[PDB]
Design a protein around this nucleic acid. Structure first.
Lengths: 165, 210, 173, 60, 167
RNA sequence: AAAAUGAAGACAUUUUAACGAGUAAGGAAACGAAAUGGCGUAAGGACAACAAAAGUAGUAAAGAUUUAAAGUAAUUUAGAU
RNA sequence: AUAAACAUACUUUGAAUCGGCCAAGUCUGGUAAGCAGGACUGGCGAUGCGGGAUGAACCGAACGUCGAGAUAAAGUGCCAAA
RNA sequence: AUUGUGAAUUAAAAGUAAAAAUCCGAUAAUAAUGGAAUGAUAAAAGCUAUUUAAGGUAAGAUUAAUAAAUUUAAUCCCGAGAAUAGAAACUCUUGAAGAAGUAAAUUAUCUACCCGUCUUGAAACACGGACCAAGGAGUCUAACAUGGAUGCGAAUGA
């Protein structure tokens, strides 16, 4: 039976990383957040002022407003049988840029490089390039032939039991 | 007026001839590859199957919510119900999760032929209409270049470009009963039980089930 | 019981893809035989199905299933105490036949189910290398014994009447 | 007359009969509490653009 | 059995004329026939709106018709609801088809040079609908909607049904 | 549920498809393609032989006892005393 | 990738209910309990049918009225179909 | 110190390497012959006959070159479409001397714990109930709200 404190059950959650105490990097306060970005809430116990509630720890949210010192973040919270929208205002020390769209932005960039080539190619009248193939779950690999010149065989059989004492 | 019936009949034969050409040509190419590999002393690795038929083995009582959702995603909502499923990383993991409730394997062409011809049906206007003519197949799957029952059989077996649209139109098959296992359906087929991946041995079960 | 010849390769960073694993697996069918093969790879070479390709799985048929041979089987089984290695000898005409005897014999003498026994190897020994106390007597040239107390044989189930007529008798046979 | 205190049994089954009601799109587009200067710029342009739009209507 | 998400229950859409109005029954018979044969989305719309309950067919005033008909000079406003009269503002010349016209609304429309049509004349003249503008009145203007919800709510409080000692 | 037909037929239309367990509880009446379908008790206003003698009844009412028939059922119908 | 148009989003009004109990490749107190209390799921309550001789919970499987077949759990000396 | 058997291997003969029987593997399908449950009776996108010929991908056949071939050429065979012509109306038994069905009584195999209620759980060694008839318990007035049908509508009611 725990208590109803604001920071209950935080012996391990709010502990600093091993050999990671003291000041934070200057990239945390220098990184520029724009409205619409994706950020991850990461409570920093070393800064007691403005510490976000521990339930929002590790939640990926979107930036909805940028203030002189605080970055508004919009995350989803689960209630009895519904989902509500929580709007916060955290200092940059307690957040971190999110890489949730890291690979998506490579596929957005690759299709734009092809499209920029296609418009030019149509200007010269030459046939245009095809769009990149979509990602697929690991497909059944096709048949193949193995050259036996550089192939060695090792027999596999159950092993005689050997005592570990 | 009704002269299109003769033209449609001729067109179906043209498609049927073409489909059997593709199936037989690929069958030959594999056979010679194994033959030539033995001549050269090399090793030939077969291709993994791309098609899987799964049968629901157990009832609707006592299923965890995670398993209940997966069986609904595969349209196995009733005991003794078979559907065709593409093989990839996603589906194989899903079938492993629901292993105690399904038995599955790789069908042969004759297994696909008999299932579609005898137990085949289509969902037209929300009605599970059984297959009785090519016109009803042309109406439902004309936009997908499937105008006869042999295109339907060939597309399922080879998993063509429009497998998803063709497969999703085919209502889940309702099968008979058969001797499920040797010991019981409470153990994996590897142990002699009923559920699990039977590989090509699922055709013996389907023989008594269709 | 059937015997299979299974080969596979591993295609990943750890194992070079020029080394092929072979085994001869006894199993009721090829599906069970493959499962035994994959567990041997996984428990001895860290090879998993998702990162390996099967190549061949062909049955191995007895070459001359009309010659009586003394088979010797080296196996390990798990009891309540621990794990032990046994060497039992059987007289049969087929390798798969001898393994069928071994599984039945182990399940009776030791009450050990099939899923505790791993067949390390099965070979053929000479006539005088049989050490089984009972089986040693039938390996000679001049074995001879009168089978007594024979129950009379029935040609088929057709003549299996429930109640018979007259007296009953055995056969010195 | 001691009674059972609390149990989470059957609670998840209840919460999913009518599943988790997601918020609508308009929930994410609220603007209350935005930056003060940003709201001033946006209001200034919306007033300027409306007046230009209206004088054309009055012109025609 | 079969694991269904939910069992089959009656669809919550009306398909006939509510009540025992003989004339409104025939209108649904007429537009149910037209929508089935002509297969026009306009007749399917009029047929659907004829089957709503009285609360769901709110009124449209002559002031609202005039604003919506401003840039539609030769057109026929079609509203499946009673058309009242806004005495505050003048009524221009326009043709309206509606279920019922207020005595003052019918006089105002006629006196301006317009016409008051019923739905059978509209179907006789424009069956599929060619020079018509579909119009329906506002629904949220009902005072009953004010009291819905929790009046203690922080965001959109209700309106606290008046009663004993309400301040 | 969806198609087709629809001033009156009729069995609350025709066709196809899916479905049918259940305590507490809910589904008021009316609504032609009917937003569940019906049985029974008593009283009030009408209708009940359409050609000017217009429901049944001393040529035996209501009731009672049973025998059979219709309806899944609530119940109804008819014969005999 | 897979499924989804009798899909999806609901709005209003309102009934009953908040004594619970069981199982477990789970946990806490207790020597222990068919004890007391919890996490996740499935059930009984509200539930009949086939099997375990009999049994609220076990195994198969959930039910409109029927006919014919293939089955499930599990069985095949007699009671008892094999 | 002559000889016997022999797994296995080898030579020559025979063998184009599809018979039959048994075992081991693989399968269960096309067909035929008899039935069963629910039906139907009608003529065909039936079946059959004559014409030309899309086709026969190991395999319709014969050949030849060659061959651990689902490798090539020839000329025979059959033949889908289509056009043209052809064909299905029946027997027996029982029944106002009581058919088919239905009902009542008895017998036989299978089957069946006391109803109502509180309760997690009652057939309960939990409570009410000896039997029958008649009576017997969500109604009326008043205020508000939602909702379906109704009239009128900046008015409605009076």
């Amino acid at each position: 039976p725990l208590s109803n404190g604001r920071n209950r059950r935080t012996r391990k959650l709010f502990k600093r990383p091993f050999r990671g105490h003291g000041l934070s990097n200057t990239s945390t306060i220098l990184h520029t957040y724009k409205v619409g970005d994706y950020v991850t809430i990461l409570c920093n116990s070393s800064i007691q002022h403005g510490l976000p509630y521990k339930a929002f720890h590790g939640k990926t949210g979107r930036v909805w407003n940028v203030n002189p010192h605080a970055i508004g973040v919009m995350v989803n919270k689960k209630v009895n049988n519904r989902i509500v929208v929580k709007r916060l205002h955290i200092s940059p020390e307690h957040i971190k840029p999110s890489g949730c769209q890291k690979d998506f932005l490579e596929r957005k960039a690759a299709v734009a490089a092809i499209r920029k080539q296609n418009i030019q190619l149509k200007k010269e009248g030459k046939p245009l390039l095809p769009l990149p193939a979509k990602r697929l779950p690991k497909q059944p690999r096709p048949a193949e032939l193995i050259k036996g010149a550089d192939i060695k065989f090792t027999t596999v059989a159950p092993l005689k039991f050997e005592e570990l004492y | 007026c009704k002269a299109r019936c003769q033209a449609f009949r001729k067109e179906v034969i043209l498609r049927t001839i073409k489909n059997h050409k593709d199936i037989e040509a690929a069958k030959k190419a594999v056979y010679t590859a194994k033959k030539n590999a033995e001549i050269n002393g090399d090793l030939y690795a077969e291709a993994d199957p791309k098609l899987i038929v799964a049968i629901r083995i157990r009832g609707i009582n006592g299923v965890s919510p995670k398993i209940k959702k997966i069986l609904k995603l595969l349209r196995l909502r009733q005991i003794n119900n078979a559907v065709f499923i593409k093989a990839n990383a996603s589906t194989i993991k899903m079938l492993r999760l629901v292993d105690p409730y399904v038995t599955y394997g790789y069908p042969t062409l004759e297994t696909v032929q008999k299932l579609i011809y005898k137990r085949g049906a289509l969902k037209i206007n929300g009605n599970r209409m059984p297959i009785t003519s090519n016109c009803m197949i042309k109406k439902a799957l004309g936009d997908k270049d499937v105008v006869c029952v042999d295109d339907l059989v060939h597309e399922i077996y080879t998993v063509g470009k429009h497998f998803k649209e063709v497969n999703n139109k085919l209502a889940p098959f309702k099968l008979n009963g058969a001797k499920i296992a040797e010991k019981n359906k409470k153990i994996h087929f590897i142990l002699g039980g009923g559920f699990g991946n039977r590989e090509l041995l699922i055709n013996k079960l389907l023989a008594n089930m269709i | 019981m059937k015997e299979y010849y299974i080969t596979a390769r591993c295609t990943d960073k750890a194992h070079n893809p020029n080394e092929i694993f072979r085994s001869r697996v006894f199993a009721p069918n090829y599906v069970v035989a493959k499962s035994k093969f994959w567990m041997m790879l996984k428990k001895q070479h860290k090879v998993k199905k998702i990162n390996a390709e099967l190549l061949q799985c062909q049955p191995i048929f007895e070459k001359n299933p009309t010659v009586v041979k003394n088979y010797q089987i080296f196996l390990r089984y798990v009891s309540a105490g621990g794990i032990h290695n046994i060497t039992k000898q059987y007289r049969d005409v087929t390798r798969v036949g001898a393994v069928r005897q071994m599984y039945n014999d182990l399940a009776s003498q030791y009450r050990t189910r099939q899923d505790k026994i791993q067949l390390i190897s099965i070979t053929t020994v000479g006539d005088k290398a049989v050490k089984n106390p009972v089986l040693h007597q039938f390996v000679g040239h001049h074995v001879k014994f009168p089978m007594v107390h024979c129950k009379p044989v029935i040609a088929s189930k057709r003549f299996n009447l429930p109640i018979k007529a007259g007296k009953l008798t055995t056969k010195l046979c | 007359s001691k009674d059972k205190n609390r149990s989470s049994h059957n609670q998840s089954h209840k919460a999913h009969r009518n599943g988790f009601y997601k918020p609508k799109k308009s929930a994410y587009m609220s603007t209350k509490g935005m930056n003060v200067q940003v709201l001033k710029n946006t209001k200034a342009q919306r007033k300027f653009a409306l007046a230009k739009k209206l004088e054309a209507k009055k012109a025609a | 059995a079969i694991d269904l998400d939910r069992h089959h229950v009656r669809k919550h859409v009306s398909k006939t004329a509510r009540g025992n109005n003989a004339y409104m029954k025939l209108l649904v018979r007429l537009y149910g026939f037209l929508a089935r044969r002509t297969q026009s989305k306009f007749a399917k719309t009029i047929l659907h709106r004829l089957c709503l309950s009285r609360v769901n067919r709110p009124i449209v005033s002559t002031s609202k018709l005039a604003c919506l008909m401003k840039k539609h000079p030769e057109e026929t406003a079609v509203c499946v609801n009673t058309v009242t009269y806004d005495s505050r503002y003048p009524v221009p010349k326009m043709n309206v088809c509606a279920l019922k016209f207020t005595k003052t609304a019918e006089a105002a429309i006629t006196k301006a040079g317009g016409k008051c049509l019923r739905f059978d004349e509209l179907a006789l003249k424009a069956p599929t609908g060619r020079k018509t503008v579909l119009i329906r009145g506002k629904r949220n203007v009902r005072e009953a909607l004010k009291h819905f919800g929790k009046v203690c709510a922080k965001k959109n409080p209700a309106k606290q049904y008046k009663g004993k000692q309400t301040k």
